[PDB]
Amino acid sequence: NILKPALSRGQLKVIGATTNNEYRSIVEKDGAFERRFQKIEVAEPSVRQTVAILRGLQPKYEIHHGVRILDSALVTAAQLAKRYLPYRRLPDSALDLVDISCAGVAVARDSK
Amino acid sequence: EYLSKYAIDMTEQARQGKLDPVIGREEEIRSTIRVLARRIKSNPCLIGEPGIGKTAIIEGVAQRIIDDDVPTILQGAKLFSLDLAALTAGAKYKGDFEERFKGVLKEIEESKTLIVLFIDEIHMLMGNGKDDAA
Amino acid sequence: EYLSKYAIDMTEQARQGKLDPVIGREEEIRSTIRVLARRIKSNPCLIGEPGIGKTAIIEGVAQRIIDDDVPTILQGAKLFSLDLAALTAGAKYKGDFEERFKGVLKEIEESKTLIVLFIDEIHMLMGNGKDDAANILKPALSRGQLKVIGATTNNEYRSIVEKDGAFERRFQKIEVAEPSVRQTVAILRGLQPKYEIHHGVRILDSALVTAAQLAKRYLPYRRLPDSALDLVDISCAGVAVARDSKQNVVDSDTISETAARLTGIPVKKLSESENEKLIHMERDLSSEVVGQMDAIKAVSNAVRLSRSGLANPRQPASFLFLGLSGSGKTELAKKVAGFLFNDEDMMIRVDCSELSEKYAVSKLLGTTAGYVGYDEGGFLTNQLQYKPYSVLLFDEVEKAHPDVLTVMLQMLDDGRITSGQGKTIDCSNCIVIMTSNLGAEFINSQQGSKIQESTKNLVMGAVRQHFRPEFLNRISSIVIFNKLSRKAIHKIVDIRLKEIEERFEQNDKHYKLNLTQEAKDFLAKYGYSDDMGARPLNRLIQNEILNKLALRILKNEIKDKETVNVVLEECLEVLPNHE
Numbered sequence: 001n002i003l004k005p006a007l008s009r010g011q012l013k014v015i016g017a018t019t020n021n022e023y024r025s026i027v028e029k030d031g032a033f034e035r036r037f038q039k040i041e042v043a044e045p046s047v048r049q050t051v052a053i054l055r056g057l058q059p060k061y062e063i064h065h066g067v068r069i070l071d072s073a074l075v076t077a078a079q080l081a082k083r084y085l086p087y088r089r090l091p092d093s094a095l096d097l098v099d100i101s102c103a104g105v106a107v108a109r110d111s112k
Numbered sequence: 113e114y115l116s117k118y119a120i121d122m123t124e125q126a127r128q129g130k131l132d133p134v135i136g137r138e139e140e141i142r143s144t145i146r147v148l149a150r151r152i153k154s155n156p157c158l159i160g161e162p163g164i165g166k167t168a169i170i171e172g173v174a175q176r177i178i179d180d181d182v183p184t185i186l187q188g189a190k191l192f193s194l195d196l197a198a199l200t201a202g203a204k205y206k207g208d209f210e211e212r213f214k215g216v217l218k219e220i221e222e223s224k225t226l227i228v229l230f231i232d233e234i235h236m237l238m239g240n241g242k243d244d245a246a
Numbered sequence: 247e248y249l250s251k252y253a254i255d256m257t258e259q260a261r262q263g264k265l266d267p268v269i270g271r272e273e274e275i276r277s278t279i280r281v282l283a284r285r286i287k288s289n290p291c292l293i294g295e296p297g298i299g300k301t302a303i304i305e306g307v308a309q310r311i312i313d314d315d316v317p318t319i320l321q322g323a324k325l326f327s328l329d330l331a332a333l334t335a336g337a338k339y340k341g342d343f344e345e346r347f348k349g350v351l352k353e354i355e356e357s358k359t360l361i362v363l364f365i366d367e368i369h370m371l372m373g374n375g376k377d378d379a380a381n382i383l384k385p386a387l388s389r390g391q392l393k394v395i396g397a398t399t400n401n402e403y404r405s406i407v408e409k410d411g412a413f414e415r416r417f418q419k420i421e422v423a424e425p426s427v428r429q430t431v432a433i434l435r436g437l438q439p440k441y442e443i444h445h446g447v448r449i450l451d452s453a454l455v456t457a458a459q460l461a462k463r464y465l466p467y468r469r470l471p472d473s474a475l476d477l478v479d480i481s482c483a484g485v486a487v488a489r490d491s492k493q494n495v496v497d498s499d500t501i502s503e504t505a506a507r508l509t510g511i512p513v514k515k516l517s518e519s520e521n522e523k524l525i526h527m528e529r530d531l532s533s534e535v536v537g538q539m540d541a542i543k544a545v546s547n548a549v550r551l552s553r554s555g556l557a558n559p560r561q562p563a564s565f566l567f568l569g570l571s572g573s574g575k576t577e578l579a580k581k582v583a584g585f586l587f588n589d590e591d592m593m594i595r596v597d598c599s600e601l602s603e604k605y606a607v608s609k610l611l612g613t614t615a616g617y618v619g620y621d622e623g624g625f626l627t628n629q630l631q632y633k634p635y636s637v638l639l640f641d642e643v644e645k646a647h648p649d650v651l652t653v654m655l656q657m658l659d660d661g662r663i664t665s666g667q668g669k670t671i672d673c674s675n676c677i678v679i680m681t682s683n684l685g686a687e688f689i690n691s692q693q694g695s696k697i698q699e700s701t702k703n704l705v706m707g708a709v710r711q712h713f714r715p716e717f718l719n720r721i722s723s724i725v726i727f728n729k730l731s732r733k734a735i736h737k738i739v740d741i742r743l744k745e746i747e748e749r750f751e752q753n754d755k756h757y758k759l760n761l762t763q764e765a766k767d768f769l770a771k772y773g774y775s776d777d778m779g780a781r782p783l784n785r786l787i788q789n790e791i792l793n794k795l796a797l798r799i800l801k802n803e804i805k806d807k808e809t810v811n812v813v814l815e816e817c818l819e820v821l822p823n824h825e
């Protein structure tokens with residue numbers, strides 16, 4: 001009855017999260033969970049939105065790595081993420097480019 | 113008493129207004145009652161898709177009992193919902209959990225009104241492929 | 247006295263009248279006694295399907311002992327029901343399990359006669375992973391008589407033997423038979439007074455006969471010793487239950503109807519009206535399906551024969567629907583379900599469109615153990631096990647490969663279809679409707695809307711070329727649907743327009759259907775693409791009416807209702823504005 005009697009009574013508020021195909025498995029294997037949880041579709045952000053996110057996270061990266069990030073750099077990460085990493089969704093794809101680039105600067109400092 | 117630890121008094125909850133009033137399903141509640149009113153193997157099980165309302169029927173049973181819509185045969189009755197915990201509270205010390213279960217059964221038959229026990233998720237009764245099902 | 251702490255004295259129960267007497271089991275009882283009389287292989291094992299009187303024999307033995315129908319050799323023995331608490335009373339303390347079996351296995355022979363132990367479920371011994379779980383005490387001590395009688399399910403016996411070995415060598419396997427209906431009734435009669443007394447109702451003797459006979463036909467999943475009693479006990483309760491809510495058990499009005507409430511099977515409800523079940527069927531099927539009256543009657547009549555169980559106990563109502571596509575070859579089937587279950591969606595559609603002999607049977611019946619995924623029964627087993635009188639539809643059964651057709655051969659004649667699991671279904675109470683397009687080559691000649699004799703034979707030729715006659719010979723009727731004469735089309739257009747209204751959810755916008763004879767003729771005339779049946783009428787309506795309507799709705803040019811007129815096939819009907 002994992003979470004069951006409580007979810008069924010409005011008690012034990014639970015916020016779940018999973019991947020579309022994982023969900024598919026929930027729906028097929030249990031079914032009743034789909035009747036216990038309210039599905040909320042989460043949408044991939046656009047490039048513009050992705051950049052806004054990156055700007056917001058920019059200080060976490062600058063502080064962590066000890067680097068300064070140009071705004072055009074973040075725009076670039078989002079554009080390149082969409083164009084060159086088509087199989088992986090934008091939030092991480094852009095962040096990987098930003099985070100790794102920042103890391104590279106830091107690593108490079110210790111290379112000399 | 114094991115019922116005070118391992119089961120919910122559905123009829124208490126009905127009495128307390130904690131259960132939704134049942135709407136319709138008159139034939140299903142009558143069918144349920146006719147089976148419970150049997151003398152031999154009086155054990156109905158509600159089958160249907162999840163999301164159908166079969167629990168609501170069980171709540172309906174409790175409501176019928178509270179307001180005595182239940183036939184004379186079954187009016188002097190109580191309805192409890194057995195948690196899996198009777199068995200799933202831990203099997204440490206093989207057989208103990210089966211004994212708690214049997215304990216519950218002793219309480220149910222022993223005199224104190226026609227106590228009927230509700231088994232939710234009856235699939236759990238399957239045990240470990242018979243074997244542990246005892 | 248371990249036995250007085252952990253076991254029930256079965257002869258106590260016999261003496262106290264707590265056990266039911268048994269009928270017809272005398273030889274099987276004698277067999278267990280004769281085995282006990284042996285010095286070697288002295289422990290009988292009652293083996294059979296669940297419910298096949300295995301403990302009835304044992305309970306019967308206890309009575310035969312107190313009644314002295316047992317050799318004195320054995321008669322002086324006492325019988326006890328063991329296991330369970332015998333073991334589970336201990337838990338902590340390794341070896342307690344042996345200590346629990348040990349004094350039992352000593353007291354059993356210590357002066358106070360010989361005690362026969364009953365392990366009703368031998369299969370629950372041996373040990374869960376062996377673990378020397380005191381089971382070893384049995385073989386170890388088994389030389390000292392310590393006679394044990396036990397029982398197991400046929401399936402379980404196999405498991406006992408394979409798991410232990412010694413048990414096969416120590417026990418005498420005994421097959422226990424399922425009784426015939428005649429024997430079953432005799433059993434029921436013996437128990438009749440127990441139920442009459444227990445419930446305070448009477449039972450008609452014909453009712454007992456009915457329970458056994460009815461159960462044999464409509465409860466194939468439960469063995470007669472139980473199935474017949476279930477109908478008796480449930481019925482008796484039904485009488486007492488109704489009586490004692492805020493008399494006797496009638497063969498018909500109580501048992502036949504009870505079984506139907508339990509299992510489904512409308513024909514055993516012995517309904518008060520074949521007007522509101524058959525007559526209305528023809529009318530309503532005819533009301534919605536225009537033309538093909540011949541088919542409607544064929545089905546209605548085949549269905550009629552199932553009333554009261556008159557139809558053959560091993561043959562589903564069965565049809566093969568041939569004819570022009572668009573003639574309602576599957577629409578009729580839905581309407582039949584629409585009548586039978588008062589709901590068209592209750593029909594079990596079988597996707598015959600997708601068949602290969604290598605998957606074709608397996609997706610219907612599933613597979614055996616050892617194969618990726620068991621969940622057997624995709625389309626047939628999983629439905630028929632729960633819906634005894636469902637109606638099946640095979641959309642293009644003709645695309646089936648011989649393996650499926652073989653399943654259908656069984657279905658159509660002794661429908662004890664074996665699932666991949668190995669368990670049968672027994673769906674003789676279902677309705678089987680199958681379809682095919684084979685007659686297209688002849689019916690498309692358009693030479694007469696009612697199938698003509700030449701056409702009929704040519705169509706049946708193709709059917710007989712395609713399916714083996716063995717299949718065809720098992721179908722209740724083969725019907726070639728009539729083509730949709732213009733006459734039919736006018737009636738159909740009205741029906742379709744109403745259907746559109748009926749399906750239009752929340753009909754704020756609703757059809758006025760100011761068809762007038764002119765648009766009726768427009769749809770009926772221009773939509774009469776005879777060689778495609780009625781289906782094109784739908785396309786015409788979508789193209790000419792609904793598209794415009796949808797646009798006017800989107801533009802909010804319509805607030806409610808729905809104006810119709812003809813503006814002037816070039817007129818295109820054209821619905822008017824509204825607001």
Ligand SMILES: Nc1ncnc2c1ncn2[C@@H]1O[C@H](COP(=O)(O)OP(=O)(O)OP(=O)(O)O)[C@@H](O)[C@H]1O
Pocket residue numbers: 032035132133134135136137161162163164165166167168169
């Ligand atoms: N006929 C009804 N009368 C009153 N309440 C109902 C009725 N049908 C549904 N409900 C309400 O909605 C729920 C019906 O779902 P129910 O609890 O029966 O789930 P369920 O059918 O048991 O499915 P499950 O197998 O996930 O338990 C009830 O909890 C009740 O609140």
Ligand SMILES: Nc1ncnc2c1ncn2[C@@H]1O[C@H](COP(=O)(O)OP(=O)(O)OP(=O)(O)O)[C@@H](O)[C@H]1O
Pocket residue numbers: 534535536537538570571572573574575576577578641683730738741779780781784
């Ligand atoms: N005799 C009829 N009266 C009213 N409507 C009909 C009639 N025949 C056909 N229709 C309409 O046309 C369609 C007939 O569907 P149906 O699938 O039976 O055609 P079909 O011949 O089965 O197609 P196919 O042979 O490929 O399964 C239905 O959608 C129904 O609305």
